[PDB]
């Protein structure tokens, strides 16, 4: 019991340094966040030891494109123009304890988009996939979800709604 569904993660972005509310990444198909340490090991006849190299960190994902949108168009501008982007990963079902009562548990990143591929095939909705390269230590916190996007603008049909 209490297993954790993927679709309860909310991924948000905004262009770094401009005063605007973060924009939600709609229609994610799959997602992943990776951290990996580039450790060497040094041998000696007294015995080998392992040396603490630096860590590379990256976020990756796939989404379906749609007509009421302008955000994949921002990702493909950002990868070419080397624009710095802030991003959040927020857990839509862990609320903050007190004072942060209206916020949800999150990681904050800033970094650059490093990949964007469109994939189009006959008999299919075209996908895009991207990679984002994190700068430094990602920062823990609690994040406000943009309530007008997440709960006010509900829609009927197969779009998820309460």
């Amino acid at each position: 019991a209490n297993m954790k569904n993927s679709n309860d993660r909310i991924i948000l972005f905004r262009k770094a340094g401009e005063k605007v509310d973060a924009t939600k990444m709609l229609f994610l198909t799959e997602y992943g966040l990776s951290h990996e340490a580039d450790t060497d090991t040094e041998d000696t006849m007294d015995g080998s030891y392992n040396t603490g190299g630096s860590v590379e960190s990256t976020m990756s994902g796939t989404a379906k494109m749609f007509y009421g949108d302008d955000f994949a168009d921002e990702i493909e501008d950002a990868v070419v123009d080397r624009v710095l982007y802030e991003a959040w990963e927020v857990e839509s079902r862990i609320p903050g304890k007190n004072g942060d009562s209206a916020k949800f548990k999150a990681k904050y990143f800033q970094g650059f988009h490093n990949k964007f591929e469109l994939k189009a095939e006959a008999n299919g909705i075209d996908e895009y996939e991207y990679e984002y390269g994190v700068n430094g230590r990602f920062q823990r916190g609690f994040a406000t979800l943009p309530e007008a996007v997440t709960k006010k603008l509900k829609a009927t049909g197969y779009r998820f709604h309460d």
């Binding site: 770094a16 340094g17 605007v20 800033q110 430094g136 994040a143 406000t144």
Partner: peptide, 12 residues
């Protein structure tokens, strides 16, 4: 960098 909230009131 530190943590910044999603909203325009906590812009970078």
């Amino acid at each position: 960098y530190r943590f910044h909230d999603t909203t325009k009131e906590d812009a970078l």
